[PDB]
Design a protein around this nucleic acid. Structure first.
Ligand SMILES: Nc1ncnc2c1ncn2[C@@H]1O[C@H](COP(=O)(O)OP(=O)(O)NP(=O)(O)O)[C@@H](O)[C@H]1O
Lengths: 560, 578
DNA sequence: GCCCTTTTGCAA
DNA sequence: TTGCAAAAGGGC
């Protein structure tokens, strides 16, 4: 209820205003202290500012020689707190430096910095109450305010809550050394969003096989286990090429009713049912590559729909698929001229090949251009998982349904990169096509993003630049700010930063966002696991230190 | 009418003169404060100078220990406002640093900086009044001993402001701009996304349209925000502004979603929207324009390297002569049909002396039979028809428009010369071909503009978004336009959001600058290097993310950079409506 | 990483 | 017989 110290000086140091505070022997003897990085209230001219404690140093006050006095007391062996109160009362001062960050105005908005420097005689500094801190953070907890690991510097009641307005339609970056909590942070945010706001969809690109089932003691549990614990049914769609191994695994950990929580789907299709899909994939593979699809590929890409009415034209497409190595289902009848062959049988295949046009004959001749499709082909599938995912995420059925689509990238081997690029392109094109009718309203979860946001001409770069218009959020983790382009870093809205050991990383971070210049020293020298610095635009344009929650504790606590 | 404080020191710090001001306890207790960046009047030796407040700090005055005094007062709960006047009067001081920018002489001439250093005993500092600020914002550099121009009409662009501080806004002090500044010159609109770029771009375009009705515009609308109000805000677009001002028959909107855009135009402008905007398609019918198809197929190979094939190179140069020979043109039409383009229903091709209808399969088969059962390069073109398949994306039957030629006529036509048209291009609807078509259109517009040098000036303004994407390439048409377009009367207004990515050659020769909040350090550093006057606002621009707050600088005769809160289009329309 | 150089088929 | 495409290795 009273000022902590006395303000004795103030100035403008660069783009910020700073002031000097002095703590007296009485206040120090009452146990009053100020922690570095602590948030305080500054009253000046009838206006309230938020301030941060930056520095602290000892300096003599008045006419005194603290060194001589203390050395003499030590030499003569006098207990300074019991024999010489007046000697103890002339050296027990302490100095602090406080920077003004801005002030809260009108409807919770933040006015940054200031043009008015406060005179010393009329400036006061106050300890901030939990109600004030709660208002500061607010205008399903994910973390709570903390200062380092000091006792008394923890505020379990001051929390930052998850809210779809914070994440959907906006870009979030998750940085930190390996082993410090990026994946746990992501999973806690996603579980809270799924539990509290069930109309938000997620597209998780799982490259390490950890976001569905995770039983080893090296990470937090998976989303399937979290959803089973919280009683969330029928919201996970898992795509994989190991649909039998994963089905076996799910039954040991989710029990006999695992199908109520997870739906396993294959990443394989029958290309004798989707020749247009085969041709489109072969055509797009080269655009995603350097450049210049061939003329015989553009011709097919544009005219295969026309060809479908001509059995002679379609016979050459099926022959190209069969010659590239794709296995047909037993009893597949191909009609040529005035005869029907069974390509599944070697004798009929040879007969038709010997017995065998708008550009389809060139496609048949250059059949080895389809061999890569054999990484996706499986006879008897007839699914088109690309379209299946498209209506999972952007289907008109939703208008708010909630769909967590998890892609098991490793199972695809060396086709995963091409598959990811193609799927992202399709989803973004559909989202653009639906503009003005419905919003996408889903979040792309992207780990090790430095492999996706490198080239400016990439679909992921384009999504990061233009997803806010169409309602697509992005949440990307990289372990190192220096791995991300500065153009993306500067345009990112939300930041969640754990410990970074390198000076270059913190320099890049503060070069991207100025307010991050006040925590670089803490980041460099405090390796604490699960301790985050969070920054949100435009309502919390300043860094706040949060202690993040374990997913196990969150699950055990949300049952109440 | 009294000095704010007392001047205690003066010197020169580099290319500028500076002085030190002290605010005493009596002034500080009356509420007198100086804001950072505020402009003040400095009187010295009978001359008046303009100064700006740069810094502020606390320093002891005389013999006194403020720390000990204030600590002793604090430990006794002494209120240094009603209890210890003597203790308060010994510590209540404050220091400020003020730079001398120049002075106003004669009839508004601005003399920059000064060779005289004011002595400290007779120098006085005064808070500037609104009338003085109004007269100061109108001063500019002039030759010498000459009379002021007495130029054309001027319009309010924004009003003076000093951040977000209370008492820092001066709604009666407005910066008036002559729209001719934007005609034939380069304008840079830097800033973060969502901070006012679109509003000020629309204000500039509306002022140009109202003041100079003979100047045309070519807007490459990437975000689709210049025609109507987007479904995220309610700021009127160019079409609604032109309806409000009663400007008729000037907007030509090219798009591939004519039905949706016509529905929106109806719902927003009423039932007479056709009197204000004309909607045209972006798709061509290549049976009406086989020369366009041949040119596209020929130039696609060239722009990617390697010599084009002989048959394509021959067709490019001889298709106009082939038009008089139906037997030779039938092969071109057959090549298009084989490539797969869809003909308009009822199309007829005359081969030999027989008339066929390629829109029907039986007739098409008959024509194919007759064609094979050396007419220049036409037969070689027909044999290799698969070179035209890529046109299926750009083709639509029954158009007979050729937007590429229509836009060139609109912008550089003799009949349409005068009362310049406002062409707006809906780039998103083009999909992947947007950049290709934009570059082609700009090239074929620059060529015609250079050709017409002597008979008629180009006289149109190019509106480009995310300009760092196109201005990076020094071999590009947009870089060439930025460098050379002034000679042919072609202006450029570009917004980037990342000035560091724009070459210093372009930055140094830009005339108009409007800068909003910039998050990155490199962007601000490049700005300071490019223009010296932007050195006094670098700290503000980096740490003050304020929406609608801009720093403006118009070359070459503006003294210093002016911070403004810019007027909204809604209010500008009312102002022009009175 | 990118820009020549070759064998091979399809045509007319 | 030669021009044109298309895939692939080699030189820079
Ligand atoms: N908030 C937390 N509180 C306590 N321990 C935590 C917290 N977050 C993470 N941990 C511990 O850190 C371990 C690894 O967490 P993890 O989420 O995998 O970090 P990470 O950033 O993803 N490492 P990596 O993905 O390899 O770069 C967990 O198994 C926990 O023991």
């Amino acid at each position: 209820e009273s000022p902590i110290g006395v303000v004795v000086s103030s100035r403008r140091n660069g783009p910020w205003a700073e002031l000097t505070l002095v703590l007296t022997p009485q206040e120090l003897d009452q146990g009053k202290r100020l922690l570095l990085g602590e948030l305080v209230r500054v009253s000046s001219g009838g206006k309230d500012y938020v301030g941060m404690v930056l520095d602290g140093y000892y300096e003599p006050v008045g006419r005194s020689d603290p060194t001589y006095t203390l050395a003499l007391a030590h030499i003569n062996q006098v207990d300074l707190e019991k024999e010489d109160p007046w000697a103890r009362k002339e050296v027990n001062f302490y100095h602090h430096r406080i920077v003004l960050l801005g002030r809260v105005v009108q409807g919770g908005l933040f006015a940054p910095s200031t043009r008015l420097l406060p005179p010393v005689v009329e400036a006061r500094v106050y300890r901030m109450t939990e109600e004030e801190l709660q208002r500061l953070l607010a205008a399903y907890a994910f973390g709570h305010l903390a200062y380092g690991l000091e006792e008394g510097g923890e505020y379990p009641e001051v929390v930052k809550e998850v809210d779809p307005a914070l994440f959907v339609g906006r870009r979030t970056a998750n940085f930190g050394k390996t082993g410090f909590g990026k994946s746990n942070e992501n999973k806690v945010i996603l579980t809270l969003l799924a539990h509290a706001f069930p109309r938000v969809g997620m597209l998780i690109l799982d490259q390490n096989a950890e976001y569905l089932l995770q039983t080893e003691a090296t990470t937090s549990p998976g989303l399937a286990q979290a959803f089973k614990a919280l009683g969330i049914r029928g919201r996970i769609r898992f795509y994989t090429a190991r649909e039998e191994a994963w089905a076996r695994r799910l039954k040991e950990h989710l029990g006999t009713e695992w199908r109520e929580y997870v739906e396993v789907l294959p990443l394989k299709v029958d290309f004798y049912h989707f020749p247009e899909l085969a041709v489109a994939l072969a055509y797009q593979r080269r655009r995603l590559q350097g450049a210049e699809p061939p003329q015989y590929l553009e011709n097919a890409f544009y005219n295969l729909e026309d060809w479908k009415h001509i059995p002679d034209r379609m016979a050459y497409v099926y022959g190209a698929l069969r010659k590239a190595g794709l296995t047909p289902r037993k009893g597949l009848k191909i009609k040529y001229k005035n005869e029907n062959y069974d390509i599944s049988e070697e004798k009929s295949w040879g007969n038709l090949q010997e017995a065998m046009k708008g550009g389809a004959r060139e496609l048949y001749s250059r059949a080895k251009v389809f061999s890569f499709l054999r990484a996706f082909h499986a006879p008897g599938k007839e699914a088109n998982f690309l379209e299946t995912i498209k209506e999972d995420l952007l289907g008109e059925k939703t208008e708010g349904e909630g769909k967590v689509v998890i892609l098991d990238l490793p199972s695809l081997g060396e086709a995963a990169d091409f598959f990811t690029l193609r799927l992202m392109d399709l989803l973004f094109d559909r989202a653009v096509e639906l503009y003005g009718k419905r919003q996408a309203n889903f979040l792309v979860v992207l780990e090790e993003a430095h492999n996706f946001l490198e080239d400016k001409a990439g679909i992921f770069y384009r999504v990061a630049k233009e997803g806010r218009k169409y309602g697509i959020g992005m949440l990307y983790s990289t372990q190192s700010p220096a791995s991300i382009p500065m153009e993306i870093l500067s345009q990112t809205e939300n930041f969640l930063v754990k410990h970074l050991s390198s000076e270059e990383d913190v320099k890049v971070l503060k070069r991207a966002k100025a307010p991050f210049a006040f925590v670089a020293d803490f980041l460099l020298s405090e390796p604490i696991i699960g301790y985050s610095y969070v920054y949100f635009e435009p309502y919390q344009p300043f860094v706040v230190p949060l202690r993040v929650k374990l997913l196990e504790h969150v699950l055990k606590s949300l049952d109440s």
